[PDB]
Amino acid sequence: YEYVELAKASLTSAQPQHFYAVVIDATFPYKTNQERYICSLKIVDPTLYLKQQKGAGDASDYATLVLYAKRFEDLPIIHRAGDIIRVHRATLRLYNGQRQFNANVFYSSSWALFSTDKRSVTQEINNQDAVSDTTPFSFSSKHATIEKNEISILQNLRKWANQYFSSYSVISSDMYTALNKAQAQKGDFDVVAKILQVHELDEYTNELKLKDASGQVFYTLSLKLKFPHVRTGEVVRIRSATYDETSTQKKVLILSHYSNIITFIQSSKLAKELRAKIQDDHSVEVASLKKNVSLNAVVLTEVDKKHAALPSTSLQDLFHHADSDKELQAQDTFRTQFYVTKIEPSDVKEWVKGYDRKTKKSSSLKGASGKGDNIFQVQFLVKDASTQLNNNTYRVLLYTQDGLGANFFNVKADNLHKNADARKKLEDSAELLTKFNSYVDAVVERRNGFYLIKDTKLIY
Amino acid sequence: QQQSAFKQLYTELFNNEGDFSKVSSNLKKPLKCYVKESYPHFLVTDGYFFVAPYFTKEAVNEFHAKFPNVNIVDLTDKVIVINNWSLELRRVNSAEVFTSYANLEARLIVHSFKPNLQERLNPTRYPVNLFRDDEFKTTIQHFRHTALQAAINKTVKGDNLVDISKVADAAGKKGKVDAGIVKASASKGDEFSDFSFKEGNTATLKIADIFVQEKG
DNA sequence: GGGGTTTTGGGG
DNA sequence: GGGTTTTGGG
DNA sequence: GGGGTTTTGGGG
Ligand SMILES: [Cl-]
Ligand code: NA
Ligand code: NA
Ligand code: NA
Numbered sequence: 001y002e003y004v005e006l007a008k009a010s011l012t013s014a015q016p017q018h019f020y021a022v023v024i025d026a027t028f029p030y031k032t033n034q035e036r037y038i039c040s041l042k043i044v045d046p047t048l049y050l051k052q053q054k055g056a057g058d059a060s061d062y063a064t065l066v067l068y069a070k071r072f073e074d075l076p077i078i079h080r081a082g083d084i085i086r087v088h089r090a091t092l093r094l095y096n097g098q099r100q101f102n103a104n105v106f107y108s109s110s111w112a113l114f115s116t117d118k119r120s121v122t123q124e125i126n127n128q129d130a131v132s133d134t135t136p137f138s139f140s141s142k143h144a145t146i147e148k149n150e151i152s153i154l155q156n157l158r159k160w161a162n163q164y165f166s167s168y169s170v171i172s173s174d175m176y177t178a179l180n181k182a183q184a185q186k187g188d189f190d191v192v193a194k195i196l197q198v199h200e201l202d203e204y205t206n207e208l209k210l211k212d213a214s215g216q217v218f219y220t221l222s223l224k225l226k227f228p229h230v231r232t233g234e235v236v237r238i239r240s241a242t243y244d245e246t247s248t249q250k251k252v253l254i255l256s257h258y259s260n261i262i263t264f265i266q267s268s269k270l271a272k273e274l275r276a277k278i279q280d281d282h283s284v285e286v287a288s289l290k291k292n293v294s295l296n297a298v299v300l301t302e303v304d305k306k307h308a309a310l311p312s313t314s315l316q317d318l319f320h321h322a323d324s325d326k327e328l329q330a331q332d333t334f335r336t337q338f339y340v341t342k343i344e345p346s347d348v349k350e351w352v353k354g355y356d357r358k359t360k361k362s363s364s365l366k367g368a369s370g371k372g373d374n375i376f377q378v379q380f381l382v383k384d385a386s387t388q389l390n391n392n393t394y395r396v397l398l399y400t401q402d403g404l405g406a407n408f409f410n411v412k413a414d415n416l417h418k419n420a421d422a423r424k425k426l427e428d429s430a431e432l433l434t435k436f437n438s439y440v441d442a443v444v445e446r447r448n449g450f451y452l453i454k455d456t457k458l459i460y
Numbered sequence: 461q462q463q464s465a466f467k468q469l470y471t472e473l474f475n476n477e478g479d480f481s482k483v484s485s486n487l488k489k490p491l492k493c494y495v496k497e498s499y500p501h502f503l504v505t506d507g508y509f510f511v512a513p514y515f516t517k518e519a520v521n522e523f524h525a526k527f528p529n530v531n532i533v534d535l536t537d538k539v540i541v542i543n544n545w546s547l548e549l550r551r552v553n554s555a556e557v558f559t560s561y562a563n564l565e566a567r568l569i570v571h572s573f574k575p576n577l578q579e580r581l582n583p584t585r586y587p588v589n590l591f592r593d594d595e596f597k598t599t600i601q602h603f604r605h606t607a608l609q610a611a612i613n614k615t616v617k618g619d620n621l622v623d624i625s626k627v628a629d630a631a632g633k634k635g636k637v638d639a640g641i642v643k644a645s646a647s648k649g650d651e652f653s654d655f656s657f658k659e660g661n662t663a664t665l666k667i668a669d670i671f672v673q674e675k676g
Numbered sequence: 677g678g679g680g681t682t683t684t685g686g687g688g
Numbered sequence: 689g690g691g692t693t694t695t696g697g698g
Numbered sequence: 699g700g701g702g703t704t705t706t707g708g709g710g
Contacts, residue, residue: 102689677704686708
């Protein structure tokens, strides 16, 4: 096997050529008819990656790889830009000015993906370690062989990628559209924004809250199975999106089965800049809190920074498996998202009770401050996506007698029967928490079969 | 202003507890829509979303009368006009019916439709399942939320707060998490079904019976 | 022609 | 190939 | 045997 560089490959030979390259863009493997799936990607290498830089403004130059197959599972799922792909038996030809490598996987061609970073997207998600720095994390056919003389090509190109992605944008400005201009586009376009929020709409759908360099905020539905790598605070490139003219309550982007959401490798200059540049936005939320019914989801709380890197557990696992699941028994602390259907006690004035640390009993303060230490004794009746269809409501308490979640309301416990300022603030929070589309991202601690909120503060 | 006829119609129906009467009568005008598919699934588009119209035994017949040579299961790519239609709510199993969401389906019952043969409609965006639309999905969720919130406030009473002594000083205390589960309503099974909208129901033909009835 | 598979030399 | 299936992730 | 493919009948 001989490996040719993208710019040195023959155009007149029409003979099968092989090469290594870095993937900077790619559609998702899609079906075109009753027998063919396709995946087109933009590849680069040390001899083909930049355009005539004088009047090019540092625009990226690339080649196009079109892989044809008869089965979905025979095409590469590109989740992240920057990784490497090895192709065998590709036919090159000029397609409208650019070098187009074509490979009929459904015949004799084959591909292989190599993680530029330590772990591949998948391995990162599963917390798995790579078998080695020479093992493909995915490849066509039943077998893949990495000859000893290749280790150099792979290692070198891997290095080139980092230097490359760190020195240039890779995804230049001519490769995507500004969100504040998305409505001006005639058809589909590409986006490069930060994922401000990942809202679990339902059992199989995530709703991404995007915001790019233009400051515009758009929403789009992203399946959990197809895009399990979406992460808050991360920057992604959306290949092929359309402005939804039929969405009046909120700016929405429509994706197609061939559309793809791609992240970037660690060394990405663009990703780094946009991560720090594009800051969180709550304008949509703040504004939606003025309307009776908001079709926009609002995450009312925020967990302490120390928990920011903690996987969330659904109410389903929390209440129906926490006592039978081997892995859910070793932990007593969990992070979860849900919406409040009801708050008890009904009377907001009874939210703060008097607590006698002795008899362990609490009582109403409707009659002076002697009852004891003032604490929050609130019981939330929640529900979430995982339990959306069942006839249940789950109990989540905010009992601050021991300090846990004592600041959830940003209001220190006090006799709400006498302190009008405190009672009023809580009554307002009560309306928000029970309002449709309002959610709570909170950390909880399992204490004697119950889940008490802790390290969670309202941000509205 | 909503540009999609289907979205506006189905939304107003849901927002009005599935009462086809409370929904604006200004939208009860004839509906001219393209036919994306016709078998195994008959789907029409209002230029933005596609919906599956449920034909009554009357409709499919009247159709055949003024149009004997016309096969309904072959109208694909051809546009049709509906002069007599009514939207009604129906509880279904979204795990099987892809034209629904959260086990709730807003059906378009067609009483009579005419085939505008060869008429060439205007090219529009690629049609999508209205039941996969972000805003419309949320709309339905709002619908269920209201029904769920009212149901719980009617079933849950007496501020039966978890006794604090159970969570306070609970070092030697162990409990089963399923002790926090609470039944929303009187609903029979494990599925919440305490809705207030009067679930309509009208005998409708299965797209299959209209197939054999034209090409056994 | 050459895989992959088994047809083990020959269809279209 | 900067594209549209049914599996109604595709 | 049958794809894809062009070898268009014959290798291994
Ligand atoms: Cl416990
Ligand atoms: Na052979
Ligand atoms: Na053989
Ligand atoms: Na052959």
